[PDB]
Subunit: 237 residues, 6 copies
């Protein structure tokens, strides 16, 4: 193959993990997958396919923003027979009780983008994740002794929004974390009949800017990828 993915049917697994930063795709491939092979290099957006406890899995970065992940998720769904897409990354929190490094599952994703209105006759489309995929992630987290919060995410189109008051609105309606893809990926999944989920670890807090050692961020990132990988094995059962 496609404009952004130079590969053929079969190169990708039916389950693709999608980190924001491409650099992270390689890290995932060599750290959690076995017998990994490179399946895409276009635009430096490296893609890998391999196995995790016998389960075939693919990993590749989806880029920053809704327009970006919309391209990749769509091509994967429609051209490589991808059934599930798990986005793994970070988010900013707005609720006082949502601490840093907390794991958040996007059962739903609010947004200020127009993609879904363009798709849904300018009405309100509830960009949601696949339920089974949400519960798998939650059960997997539980098994790893991790606490996982489930609820709405907010997919911002502007990391630097002109409306600083929107953060208060998000806080008032329970938004768990602010990121930039969920709403988009959920839109594509519904459009092409596939299943999607977004998992985020809280990076910063719009509140008091705390601090996390590079070691801690590393630990939390591996925890999230484990949740994702284990949730897939749960979904297969």
């Amino acid at each position: 193959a496609t404009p952004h993915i130079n590969a053929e049917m079969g190169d990708f697994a039916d389950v693709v993990l999608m980190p924001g930063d491409p650099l992270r795709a390689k890290y995932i491939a060599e750290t959690f997958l076995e017998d990994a092979r490179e399946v895409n290099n276009v635009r430096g957006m490296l893609g890998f396919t391999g196995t995790y406890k016998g389960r075939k899995i693919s990993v590749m970065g989806h880029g920053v923003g809704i327009p970006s992940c919309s391209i990749y998720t769509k091509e994967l769904i429609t051209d490589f027979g991808v059934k599930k897409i798990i986005r793994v990354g970070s988010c900013g929190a707005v609720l006082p009780h949502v601490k840093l490094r907390d794991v958040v599952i996007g059962m739903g994703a609010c947004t200020d983008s127009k993609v879904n209105r363009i798709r849904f006759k300018d009405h309100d489309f509830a960009a949601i994740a696949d339920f089974d995929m949400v519960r798998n992630a939650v059960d997997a987290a539980k098994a790893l002794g991790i606490d996982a919060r489930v609820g709405n995410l907010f997919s911002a189109d502007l990391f630097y929004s002109p409306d600083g008051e929107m953060f208060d609105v998000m806080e008032k309606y329970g938004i768990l974390g602010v990121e930039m893809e969920a709403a988009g990926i959920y839109g594509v999944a519904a459009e092409f009949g596939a299943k999607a989920l977004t998992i985020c670890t809280v990076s910063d807090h719009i509140r008091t800017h705390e601090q996390t050692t590079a070691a801690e961020r590393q630990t939390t990132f591996n925890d999230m990828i484990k949740i994702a990988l284990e949730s897939v094995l749960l979904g297969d059962k």
Copy 2:
């Protein structure tokens, strides 16, 4: 007491099941609740409180439409300490594979209404259910050997829409059932910090054209009610 509810703090359980039809409320109370007392009759919107296997439960109609159910769920949450509201109604299908008598659970709900937009600064609020309630519900239907699909519902403002092109859209983006309140109820729950879930049985198929009616229809409807009642018992454990 409040404008639309002639009761006092205590008259309701902390969990309220809400069908659209007040007459259906009475039916629920006399069929599944023991020692059900009538706690409200204002505007004919019958409310009842009783016990289901020892747990205090209430059931009350919320009328038809987001504007209607918004008033009641809100007054329940803010004046009668209700912590959970489970809407138990019917819906029409648009997807071919969704058959009559199918039990649908609205993890999320799309909509025609402009209510959440008024709440979310004209942005996209993903009206979603409470995850634990969705899961409790799924597990209960499972214990009763009932197949329940989880996904998106569509909350229409107009039961007689002037544009039927919207149905192809709902179908394309996978909406499981068409009703008229979920989006409103999930908006209220988020706005006032409560938890809500909407469970529906398909009573019509806007596709093959067919409105269910038989001992079978009534059997499935009661299953939905038992899934709702049983889900609170699970939420308790």
Copy 3:
């Protein structure tokens, strides 16, 4: 028989008075109509057909909100030959010089609902009543010695609006009363080819906070009814 009305062409007169409260429909039929006969109880939305000074009149509640009265007004207009709908309901005042028990005639109706935008390719549709019906009502009022302000009403989707600033805007633009149906009825009448008028009794003040009290509500409630009924006779002449 339609989906929400178990009646047959003929059970309803060509004009129907419609309060939001089903119990009011009943009260009206008992207090002002002769030979009152119940013609509908589906969903407890009581309907009646009687005689007023010899004229065949019908009265039936329509429920709370645009979605609700849209269903009932539509069904009446298309399956029961109803030519005129007169909504006789309650509203909230926002102007200082408007006090409880005041009777307002909605020559027009503003709204925050999306129904009409949906019907009008997203442009501005001026939800307006039928001129002769407004004139009849104004004339019926003078003949009764009752005062009645004619002007704009505001049909709200959220009785509990999270946007309090909007009331200031309504005030500045002279909204006489805040209710929840007008714009919808006027929307339906235009779409289905019938005529409608909304008469409302100020049951409370949005600024001062005063609900219906004393025995005053009754006669003023009856004033609205008297006006609606007489205006029907003036229209016949």
Copy 4:
């Protein structure tokens, strides 16, 4: 003197007839007004003040489009004590049963402009005329033997609309005439606290394509004027 009117408080009567065409203002002042005096020629937007059967009347063009008549109606209302504005203009018919020379009274006015949405927090404002003025006009018409339809007008921003399908929507909703000011005037009157009414003569048919012809345009043009003028007298009584 305001930015667009070189006059002084007093040069204008408390009611002003306003055609879109400055040359019509002139014709009206010469044909129907006694002691006509020019009170404005800024931007060639001719204004006059005379006497009609003893009543001080004023007539001034307002130009084409909402932005234009918004400026003039505003300036008149805030700096020249004008209490009533009667727009006497031309419109296009869209309904089959509406033919050239027909006189329509805009009880309300739909529009595709954004002015009112701007004034009304993006909600629906029902641009409506002053009831008594509409009633006066209807009465003045019967006394003249002239026919006049009362109802909705549609104020268009684009005389040459690229959206032809919209005319079908207008037709379905009974728009009596398509013009370019009503919604604006009604918008201004409400905002600045004055009263307005629009009377229009069907100068052409949007479906059949027929513009003003023969000597008929004149008397029918004069019919509208006669009605507007008389209605002013009825209002005085």
Copy 5:
């Protein structure tokens, strides 16, 4: 001839300069054109054709507002073979560094209007001028030793806006001048394949509050006119 222009193919040049004021049109013609004949007077919108240094030029007012100038520019392009339209008006500044008597060229134009949205499927159409005309204009002002700023204009629907918060916005995003037609004219030009440019002199500063008036103001206004006339001579070479 067309509804608003009483002329015949040929009466105009292929280039029309358009001030908002018809009286200003006459002023242009008698001041800069040789042997100017009047080619239109319908509705008082004076149009003139003459020659500037041997090149055939026309000048005509377009009235005030997008709805007004849209009608005229359109009829000029589609019925009188006009290929270029140069609006020459005034504008108010919002930016501190923009002083009175400053010549502004609208490379682009923002707007309040809903016209382009009707044209562009509710999306964002960037109303822009014709590049060559902008450059011709810049070069001409340069040859005349005049400093001309190029940028965005704001086309307001309401000269008396109900929200002054919009001015801080225009200023923040760098809008150079506030007028009422450019966006409309650029929309028409694109819709009918013509070329348009809007040149403005700052006659008011909504900031320091100051409306220019002196021999100086009139001197700058004539410069703008010469920049416009001279720009066509350049476009020819």
Copy 6:
């Protein structure tokens, strides 16, 4: 430094060239810049600073989509004192007369994103480039014997849009090319007072899918970078 740029004030030039694909930043640095140095590697988004004919210049990829380039352009403007941003990439054409490999300058950029409406109080912001930067690019192109088309670009948020009819609308309003950043970058520039320009070479054509050798695409890409680099030197004069 910033969340996405790990560098300090001074590391970047006041002029930054921004290709879509990061891989292209390195190619530009080693092919057209001298004494280049790496200034950013975060997320693999490589940035370089160096000189072109003595002129200090920086190059770095901005990623795919408005949300992405919005982040980088903003941080560069506000944290590294960047004055000008030139985006260099490709686009799809919709006009029959726009051939492949044609150079297009985005004087303006239409879009279906909501970023500018969020910024401009939901009104129409004309996302435009800096004029001088546009003319420099055009003159530079001319000097290289290259033909450059100037006009509107369309910044799509969905590379795979559900509305296939939008391409016809774009064609009707002269859109020169379809890409995905312009509107966004122009928005940020206006918000933070900097200058921006977008240059694109036509890659595909929504019409007949022609073909271009890798050699030809290489030649055209170098031509575009030369235009950009030379336009900067022209802007300095």
